[PDB]
Amino acid sequence: QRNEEKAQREANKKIEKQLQKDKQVYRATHRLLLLGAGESGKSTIVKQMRKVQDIKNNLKEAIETIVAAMSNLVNQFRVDYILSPPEFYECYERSNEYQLIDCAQYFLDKDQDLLRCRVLTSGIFETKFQVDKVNFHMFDVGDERRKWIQCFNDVTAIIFVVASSSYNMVINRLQEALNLFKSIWNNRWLRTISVILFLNKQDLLAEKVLAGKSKIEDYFPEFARYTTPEDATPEPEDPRVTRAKYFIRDEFLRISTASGDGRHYCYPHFTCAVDTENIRRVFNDCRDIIQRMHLRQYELL
Amino acid sequence: RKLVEQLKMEANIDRIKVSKAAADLMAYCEAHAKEDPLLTPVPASENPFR
Amino acid sequence: VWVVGMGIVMSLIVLAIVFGNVLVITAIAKFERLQTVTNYFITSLACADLVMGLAVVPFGAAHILTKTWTFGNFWCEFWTSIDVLCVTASIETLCVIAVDRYFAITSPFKYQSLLTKNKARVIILMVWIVSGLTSFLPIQMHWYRAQEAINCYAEETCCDFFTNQAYAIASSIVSFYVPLVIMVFVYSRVFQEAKRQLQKIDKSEGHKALKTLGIIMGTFTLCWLPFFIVNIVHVIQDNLIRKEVYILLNWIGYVNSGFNPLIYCRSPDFRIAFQELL
Amino acid sequence: LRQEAEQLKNQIRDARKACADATLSQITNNIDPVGRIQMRTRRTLRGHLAKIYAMHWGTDSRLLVSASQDGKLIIWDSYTTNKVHAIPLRSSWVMTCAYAPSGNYVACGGLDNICSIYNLKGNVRVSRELAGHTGYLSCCRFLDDNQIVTSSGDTTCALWDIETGQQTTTFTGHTGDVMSLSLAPDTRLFVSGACDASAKLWDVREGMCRQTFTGHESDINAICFFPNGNAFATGSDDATCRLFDLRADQELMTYSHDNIICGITSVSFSKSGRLLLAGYDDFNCNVWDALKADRAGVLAGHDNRVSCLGVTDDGMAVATGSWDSFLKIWN
Ligand SMILES: CN[C@@H]1CCc2c(ccc(O)c2O)[C@H]1O
């Protein structure tokens, strides 16, 4: 009777007490979303920021997928045996047009092998790590509609990894990746969410840029007209690629800044596979996210 | 292939006049109109909420 | 006839303070969305302004207009305690906000953890309890009473604030001077953070912060400093001050509470609540 | 090749136009209007962490369950306003919730392709985990204790058997990612809506769609059956919400407002079906006349956008969700 109603209050108190403890933990934790194309190599950043036989088996299968695709796109028994194992174990120039794993070429020619080539996962991969700051949880979507983006509204920042070197993979892939960046920027629901984008494969970018076989002007006519910014550029790199490096950033930057002002910022970072400081770069940029969000609050900015 | 097959079954579907559907739809709403607290709010004593 | 004209202006000031703080207090309580960690504090400022504009100024207006205190001797002392508690609470609360804004900007990633609904009530209660050691304690021990105009404390016809040399320095330091140093120091550091962030934006792209930061500090400094610079020098140099001069600066300070909601407003949340209210 | 199907598709539309004789509003013109409805908020059930996504009433109307991106699915008691159980979620993000007709089990969705059937009856534990879809799970419902109907973002809807743990029947052939589904009171049929602006119903035993509706032009996100079971209404991202009668194979009355240009998240009929309670992206919920096709009352008691709306089996009260973690129950 009335005791049950009193009993229900005690059960409610336990739930409220349990929820209150998690409220501080949830508020402390920060959520990020990682967006990238299949060839963007977003797994490299996640692995760098944070078995071999299993990876080798998938990598060996990946080599066959590129081998089979190359023949179709253009020792027949050996090709048939591989397409259809020690017997199976016993192109790259045209790999830009074809679809292939980035680390497949290194694997095909042949300990950081896991970092170089990693097996992808269809499911959502949640990464949790601490940088001596508040708890950080990174979420990965793992489709054309991209309706799950509208679900994300509480994330402090969005990671948008771009393969800068992958501008000659016309199916241009970079313009397609740039096109998706416009859609997320102009999203009617991403009003108070910034973006942190990494121009991955910067080292690979120079190699394509240094070699004259592929010209960036062919894909982008405005590149020849575009000139290097007067701002400081780190060097150790030739200015011929340095002008190329800034152009791809300017293309991303021009759309990002023009569309909206306030609570919509982009933090382009040039990154390389060898570099492991990207974890600190995010934290430095993540700190700027909260400040600029708070500066706009109370109209102090 | 399947869409043509799926659309093939769509041809053999019996249809009814819209007027007949409208009358049936309106009649059901009239029948259940009385037993609906949203249409007429329940008395405070009768309403379990307040 | 000039007395009639002065009464209209004084009457409007009391009315303005009552409505201004009421709307801020009503908006916070009525809507749950507006109620936040930072917005809990402004309720205390709204509460402090509300009592000041209704229980301090209206009685003070009668004292000047009628040129005499018709109420009893005890109630005049009670009014002084309420008069000083409200000013002490209002100035301190603005200093608390300065700490709140400083932590949000200068030390992020810990504002959510440090501030809490339970934590907000503790510091707010501490600020109000701080007024108790500044307002209730003097009247209980009758230490507020002074030897010039000694009969003024005795006589019930008219009473004037005649304070000892110790209390005038100590109360002014606690009420205004100490909050001033804290408020200026943290706001200077906040301005550095805004300058640094703006410089970073211009680094990767191709001030208004001072204008909005000036209003918060300027109104606090302009509307209180002339009184408190005189609230410390009349006691040490009695001949320097004039009786009518002290009153004029005092009523300038009371206008700060009325103008306080205007400074801490214009946010999108409060603009929506203004339309909903009217 | 494709020409015959296109010719057949045009012929299908011709039959629908020929099947129409009189407009629905023409018949309902003489019907007396419901009038303005002064709608209040009897309860304000709050106390959650983050934005909720879905809500479903219990069979007895005493209880309801809400699922949120905070990962805490809590079952709430309407009368006593106090929560009964809180079920932690393995997956942080959930997009659907469902309640068993028997009330013994509670189904929770998830962005990951999993539909966990939690056991209410005193430690909550998963009875089974249903998986096997490429896309995200968007809706879940309980035909009975044995059968659970789920919607996926892989453009496929499937029925799960709890004991078998496998898809007894798979419903394919649908273009867009499926957003919402509803189950008929007779449990014989159910509907499904995708971003392809196409609304289709399916027979559980047959497994093949009976009728296909494509009146809408934008993506649709809400759908529910009329209490009579012969009609359903769809809520699209476009301002218009249309009503379809399965017998007539066509849209009967379109519910649109020129002033309203926001999206629609959830829809729900009343017990008698006169009032169509529909949420909106304009932070307000609208209740419109089913027959007169005219607005009856406007309710904007929420701060964030409404994400769900359900009506009790008894019809006593309506509950609408929000992204502000405020379950405002309206009676
Ligand atoms: C007569 N009005 C009084 C006089 C002096 C005084 C006030 C407030 C706070 C103080 O710390 C004071 O010393 C004024 O409200």
mmCIF file of N, CA, C and O in Angstrom, chain A residues 2-63:
data_model
loop_
_atom_site.group_PDB
_atom_site.id
_atom_site.type_symbol
_atom_site.label_atom_id
_atom_site.label_comp_id
_atom_site.label_asym_id
_atom_site.label_seq_id
_atom_site.Cartn_x
_atom_site.Cartn_y
_atom_site.Cartn_z
ATOM 1 N N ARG A 2 0.711 2.076 1.040
ATOM 2 C CA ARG A 2 1.510 3.292 1.145
ATOM 3 C C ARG A 2 2.991 2.976 1.304
ATOM 4 O O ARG A 2 3.840 3.800 0.948
ATOM 5 N N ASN A 3 3.319 1.798 1.840
ATOM 6 C CA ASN A 3 4.719 1.407 1.966
ATOM 7 C C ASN A 3 5.372 1.255 0.599
ATOM 8 O O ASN A 3 6.549 1.591 0.425
ATOM 9 N N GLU A 4 4.623 0.743 -0.382
ATOM 10 C CA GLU A 4 5.162 0.608 -1.731
ATOM 11 C C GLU A 4 5.510 1.966 -2.325
ATOM 12 O O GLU A 4 6.556 2.122 -2.967
ATOM 13 N N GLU A 5 4.644 2.964 -2.122
ATOM 14 C CA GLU A 5 4.949 4.310 -2.592
ATOM 15 C C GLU A 5 6.199 4.851 -1.912
ATOM 16 O O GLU A 5 7.053 5.464 -2.562
ATOM 17 N N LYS A 6 6.324 4.632 -0.602
ATOM 18 C CA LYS A 6 7.564 4.970 0.086
ATOM 19 C C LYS A 6 8.722 4.141 -0.449
ATOM 20 O O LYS A 6 9.836 4.651 -0.621
ATOM 21 N N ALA A 7 8.477 2.856 -0.719
ATOM 22 C CA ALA A 7 9.517 2.005 -1.288
ATOM 23 C C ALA A 7 9.939 2.500 -2.664
ATOM 24 O O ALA A 7 11.125 2.453 -3.012
ATOM 25 N N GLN A 8 8.981 2.970 -3.465
ATOM 26 C CA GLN A 8 9.318 3.509 -4.777
ATOM 27 C C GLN A 8 10.214 4.734 -4.652
ATOM 28 O O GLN A 8 11.093 4.960 -5.491
ATOM 29 N N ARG A 9 9.999 5.543 -3.611
ATOM 30 C CA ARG A 9 10.852 6.706 -3.392
ATOM 31 C C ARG A 9 12.291 6.289 -3.119
ATOM 32 O O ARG A 9 13.232 6.917 -3.618
ATOM 33 N N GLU A 10 12.482 5.235 -2.322
ATOM 34 C CA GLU A 10 13.832 4.754 -2.043
ATOM 35 C C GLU A 10 14.511 4.255 -3.310
ATOM 36 O O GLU A 10 15.702 4.510 -3.527
ATOM 37 N N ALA A 11 13.773 3.535 -4.157
ATOM 38 C CA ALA A 11 14.329 3.093 -5.431
ATOM 39 C C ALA A 11 14.652 4.280 -6.329
ATOM 40 O O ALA A 11 15.665 4.275 -7.039
ATOM 41 N N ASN A 12 13.800 5.307 -6.313
ATOM 42 C CA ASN A 12 14.083 6.514 -7.080
ATOM 43 C C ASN A 12 15.353 7.195 -6.586
ATOM 44 O O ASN A 12 16.145 7.707 -7.385
ATOM 45 N N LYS A 13 15.561 7.213 -5.267
ATOM 46 C CA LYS A 13 16.752 7.850 -4.713
ATOM 47 C C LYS A 13 18.021 7.156 -5.187
ATOM 48 O O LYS A 13 19.024 7.815 -5.487
ATOM 49 N N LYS A 14 18.000 5.823 -5.256
ATOM 50 C CA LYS A 14 19.161 5.092 -5.752
ATOM 51 C C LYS A 14 19.453 5.445 -7.205
ATOM 52 O O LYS A 14 20.615 5.632 -7.584
ATOM 53 N N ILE A 15 18.410 5.538 -8.033
ATOM 54 C CA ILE A 15 18.603 5.891 -9.436
ATOM 55 C C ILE A 15 19.142 7.309 -9.564
ATOM 56 O O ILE A 15 20.071 7.567 -10.339
ATOM 57 N N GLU A 16 18.568 8.252 -8.812
ATOM 58 C CA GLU A 16 19.050 9.628 -8.859
ATOM 59 C C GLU A 16 20.487 9.725 -8.364
ATOM 60 O O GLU A 16 21.297 10.468 -8.929
ATOM 61 N N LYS A 17 20.819 8.986 -7.303
ATOM 62 C CA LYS A 17 22.192 8.979 -6.814
ATOM 63 C C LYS A 17 23.143 8.387 -7.847
ATOM 64 O O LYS A 17 24.240 8.915 -8.067
ATOM 65 N N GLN A 18 22.741 7.288 -8.491
ATOM 66 C CA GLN A 18 23.587 6.676 -9.509
ATOM 67 C C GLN A 18 23.758 7.592 -10.715
ATOM 68 O O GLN A 18 24.858 7.704 -11.265
ATOM 69 N N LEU A 19 22.679 8.251 -11.142
ATOM 70 C CA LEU A 19 22.771 9.161 -12.279
ATOM 71 C C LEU A 19 23.629 10.374 -11.949
ATOM 72 O O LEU A 19 24.362 10.876 -12.810
ATOM 73 N N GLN A 20 23.551 10.862 -10.709
ATOM 74 C CA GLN A 20 24.323 12.038 -10.324
ATOM 75 C C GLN A 20 25.820 11.773 -10.421
ATOM 76 O O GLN A 20 26.586 12.647 -10.842
ATOM 77 N N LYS A 21 26.255 10.575 -10.028
ATOM 78 C CA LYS A 21 27.672 10.238 -10.118
ATOM 79 C C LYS A 21 28.147 10.236 -11.565
ATOM 80 O O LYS A 21 29.249 10.707 -11.866
ATOM 81 N N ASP A 22 27.329 9.708 -12.478
ATOM 82 C CA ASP A 22 27.716 9.663 -13.882
ATOM 83 C C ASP A 22 27.615 11.023 -14.558
ATOM 84 O O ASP A 22 28.229 11.220 -15.611
ATOM 85 N N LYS A 23 26.857 11.960 -13.982
ATOM 86 C CA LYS A 23 26.723 13.279 -14.594
ATOM 87 C C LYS A 23 28.063 13.998 -14.652
ATOM 88 O O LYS A 23 28.397 14.626 -15.664
ATOM 89 N N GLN A 24 28.845 13.923 -13.573
ATOM 90 C CA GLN A 24 30.174 14.525 -13.580
ATOM 91 C C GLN A 24 31.090 13.829 -14.578
ATOM 92 O O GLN A 24 31.858 14.488 -15.287
ATOM 93 N N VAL A 25 31.026 12.498 -14.643
ATOM 94 C CA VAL A 25 31.873 11.759 -15.574
ATOM 95 C C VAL A 25 31.508 12.093 -17.014
ATOM 96 O O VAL A 25 32.388 12.311 -17.856
ATOM 97 N N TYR A 26 30.211 12.133 -17.323
ATOM 98 C CA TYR A 26 29.784 12.455 -18.681
ATOM 99 C C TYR A 26 30.188 13.870 -19.069
ATOM 100 O O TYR A 26 30.644 14.107 -20.194
ATOM 101 N N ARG A 27 30.019 14.828 -18.154
ATOM 102 C CA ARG A 27 30.409 16.202 -18.449
ATOM 103 C C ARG A 27 31.912 16.312 -18.664
ATOM 104 O O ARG A 27 32.369 17.055 -19.540
ATOM 105 N N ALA A 28 32.697 15.581 -17.871
ATOM 106 C CA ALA A 28 34.147 15.624 -18.020
ATOM 107 C C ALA A 28 34.585 15.064 -19.367
ATOM 108 O O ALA A 28 35.479 15.619 -20.016
ATOM 109 N N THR A 29 33.971 13.969 -19.804
ATOM 110 C CA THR A 29 34.379 13.327 -21.046
ATOM 111 C C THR A 29 34.026 14.194 -22.250
ATOM 112 O O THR A 29 32.985 14.856 -22.276
ATOM 113 N N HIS A 30 34.902 14.182 -23.251
ATOM 114 C CA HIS A 30 34.703 14.911 -24.495
ATOM 115 C C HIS A 30 34.541 13.932 -25.649
ATOM 116 O O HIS A 30 35.194 12.884 -25.683
ATOM 117 N N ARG A 31 33.673 14.280 -26.594
ATOM 118 C CA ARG A 31 33.337 13.412 -27.714
ATOM 119 C C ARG A 31 33.804 14.043 -29.018
ATOM 120 O O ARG A 31 33.586 15.237 -29.249
ATOM 121 N N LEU A 32 34.445 13.237 -29.863
ATOM 122 C CA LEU A 32 34.887 13.657 -31.184
ATOM 123 C C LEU A 32 34.446 12.625 -32.213
ATOM 124 O O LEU A 32 34.305 11.441 -31.903
ATOM 125 N N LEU A 33 34.229 13.086 -33.440
ATOM 126 C CA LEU A 33 33.853 12.219 -34.549
ATOM 127 C C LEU A 33 34.934 12.278 -35.616
ATOM 128 O O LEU A 33 35.360 13.368 -36.013
ATOM 129 N N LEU A 34 35.376 11.111 -36.078
ATOM 130 C CA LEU A 34 36.407 11.010 -37.101
ATOM 131 C C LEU A 34 35.750 10.733 -38.445
ATOM 132 O O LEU A 34 35.084 9.707 -38.615
ATOM 133 N N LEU A 35 35.941 11.641 -39.396
ATOM 134 C CA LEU A 35 35.395 11.509 -40.738
ATOM 135 C C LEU A 35 36.539 11.436 -41.735
ATOM 136 O O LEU A 35 37.465 12.251 -41.683
ATOM 137 N N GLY A 36 36.476 10.463 -42.638
ATOM 138 C CA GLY A 36 37.495 10.326 -43.659
ATOM 139 C C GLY A 36 37.062 9.349 -44.723
ATOM 140 O O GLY A 36 36.208 8.488 -44.490
ATOM 141 N N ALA A 37 37.659 9.483 -45.903
ATOM 142 C CA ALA A 37 37.368 8.582 -47.003
ATOM 143 C C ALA A 37 38.066 7.240 -46.792
ATOM 144 O O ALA A 37 38.854 7.055 -45.860
ATOM 145 N N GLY A 38 37.757 6.289 -47.674
ATOM 146 C CA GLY A 38 38.394 4.984 -47.589
ATOM 147 C C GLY A 38 39.895 5.055 -47.791
ATOM 148 O O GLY A 38 40.657 4.373 -47.100
ATOM 149 N N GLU A 39 40.340 5.880 -48.735
ATOM 150 C CA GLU A 39 41.758 6.071 -49.004
ATOM 151 C C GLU A 39 42.368 7.192 -48.176
ATOM 152 O O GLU A 39 43.554 7.492 -48.343
ATOM 153 N N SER A 40 41.588 7.819 -47.292
ATOM 154 C CA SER A 40 42.107 8.904 -46.472
ATOM 155 C C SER A 40 43.125 8.427 -45.447
ATOM 156 O O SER A 40 43.904 9.241 -44.942
ATOM 157 N N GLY A 41 43.140 7.137 -45.134
ATOM 158 C CA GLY A 41 44.055 6.624 -44.130
ATOM 159 C C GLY A 41 43.794 7.156 -42.739
ATOM 160 O O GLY A 41 44.745 7.448 -42.003
ATOM 161 N N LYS A 42 42.522 7.288 -42.356
ATOM 162 C CA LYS A 42 42.189 7.775 -41.024
ATOM 163 C C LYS A 42 42.664 6.833 -39.929
ATOM 164 O O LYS A 42 42.877 7.278 -38.796
ATOM 165 N N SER A 43 42.834 5.546 -40.239
ATOM 166 C CA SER A 43 43.306 4.600 -39.234
ATOM 167 C C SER A 43 44.723 4.922 -38.781
ATOM 168 O O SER A 43 45.083 4.640 -37.634
ATOM 169 N N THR A 44 45.538 5.504 -39.664
ATOM 170 C CA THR A 44 46.908 5.841 -39.291
ATOM 171 C C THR A 44 46.937 6.869 -38.166
ATOM 172 O O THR A 44 47.721 6.741 -37.220
ATOM 173 N N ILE A 45 46.086 7.894 -38.251
ATOM 174 C CA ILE A 45 46.052 8.922 -37.216
ATOM 175 C C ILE A 45 45.576 8.339 -35.892
ATOM 176 O O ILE A 45 46.142 8.631 -34.832
ATOM 177 N N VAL A 46 44.529 7.511 -35.929
ATOM 178 C CA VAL A 46 44.006 6.920 -34.701
ATOM 179 C C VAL A 46 45.055 6.029 -34.051
ATOM 180 O O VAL A 46 45.264 6.076 -32.833
ATOM 181 N N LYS A 47 45.729 5.202 -34.852
ATOM 182 C CA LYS A 47 46.784 4.352 -34.310
ATOM 183 C C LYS A 47 47.943 5.185 -33.778
ATOM 184 O O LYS A 47 48.475 4.903 -32.698
ATOM 185 N N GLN A 48 48.349 6.215 -34.524
ATOM 186 C CA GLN A 48 49.450 7.064 -34.079
ATOM 187 C C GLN A 48 49.081 7.836 -32.817
ATOM 188 O O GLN A 48 49.903 7.970 -31.904
ATOM 189 N N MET A 49 47.854 8.358 -32.753
ATOM 190 C CA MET A 49 47.437 9.108 -31.573
ATOM 191 C C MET A 49 47.394 8.217 -30.338
ATOM 192 O O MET A 49 47.853 8.614 -29.262
ATOM 193 N N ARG A 50 46.859 7.009 -30.476
ATOM 194 C CA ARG A 50 46.760 6.089 -29.350
ATOM 195 C C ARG A 50 48.044 5.283 -29.195
ATOM 196 O O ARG A 50 49.136 5.780 -29.471
ATOM 197 N N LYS A 51 46.389 -9.968 -34.904
ATOM 198 C CA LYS A 51 47.779 -9.565 -34.727
ATOM 199 C C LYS A 51 48.465 -9.358 -36.073
ATOM 200 O O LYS A 51 47.814 -9.035 -37.068
ATOM 201 N N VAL A 52 49.786 -9.547 -36.095
ATOM 202 C CA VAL A 52 50.544 -9.374 -37.332
ATOM 203 C C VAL A 52 50.119 -10.408 -38.366
ATOM 204 O O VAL A 52 49.953 -10.091 -39.550
ATOM 205 N N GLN A 53 49.944 -11.661 -37.940
ATOM 206 C CA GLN A 53 49.507 -12.703 -38.864
ATOM 207 C C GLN A 53 48.114 -12.409 -39.408
ATOM 208 O O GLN A 53 47.851 -12.607 -40.600
ATOM 209 N N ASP A 54 47.208 -11.941 -38.547
ATOM 210 C CA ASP A 54 45.868 -11.586 -39.006
ATOM 211 C C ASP A 54 45.912 -10.420 -39.985
ATOM 212 O O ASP A 54 45.198 -10.419 -40.994
ATOM 213 N N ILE A 55 46.746 -9.417 -39.702
ATOM 214 C CA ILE A 55 46.879 -8.282 -40.609
ATOM 215 C C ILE A 55 47.526 -8.717 -41.918
ATOM 216 O O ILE A 55 47.157 -8.239 -42.998
ATOM 217 N N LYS A 56 48.505 -9.622 -41.844
ATOM 218 C CA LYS A 56 49.171 -10.094 -43.054
ATOM 219 C C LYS A 56 48.199 -10.825 -43.972
ATOM 220 O O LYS A 56 48.252 -10.667 -45.197
ATOM 221 N N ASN A 57 47.309 -11.638 -43.397
ATOM 222 C CA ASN A 57 46.346 -12.372 -44.213
ATOM 223 C C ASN A 57 45.425 -11.422 -44.967
ATOM 224 O O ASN A 57 45.174 -11.608 -46.164
ATOM 225 N N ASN A 58 44.909 -10.397 -44.285
ATOM 226 C CA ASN A 58 44.094 -9.396 -44.966
ATOM 227 C C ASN A 58 44.919 -8.608 -45.974
ATOM 228 O O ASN A 58 44.445 -8.316 -47.079
ATOM 229 N N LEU A 59 46.155 -8.255 -45.611
ATOM 230 C CA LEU A 59 47.023 -7.534 -46.535
ATOM 231 C C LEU A 59 47.330 -8.373 -47.767
ATOM 232 O O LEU A 59 47.354 -7.855 -48.890
ATOM 233 N N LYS A 60 47.570 -9.671 -47.578
ATOM 234 C CA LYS A 60 47.771 -10.555 -48.720
ATOM 235 C C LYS A 60 46.525 -10.605 -49.593
ATOM 236 O O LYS A 60 46.618 -10.581 -50.826
ATOM 237 N N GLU A 61 45.346 -10.671 -48.969
ATOM 238 C CA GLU A 61 44.105 -10.612 -49.732
ATOM 239 C C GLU A 61 43.932 -9.261 -50.413
ATOM 240 O O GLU A 61 43.381 -9.191 -51.518
ATOM 241 N N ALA A 62 44.389 -8.183 -49.772
ATOM 242 C CA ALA A 62 44.303 -6.862 -50.384
ATOM 243 C C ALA A 62 45.137 -6.788 -51.657
ATOM 244 O O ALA A 62 44.730 -6.156 -52.638
ATOM 245 N N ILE A 63 46.312 -7.419 -51.653
ATOM 246 C CA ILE A 63 47.157 -7.431 -52.844
ATOM 247 C C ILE A 63 46.447 -8.138 -53.992
ATOM 248 O O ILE A 63 46.515 -7.702 -55.148
#
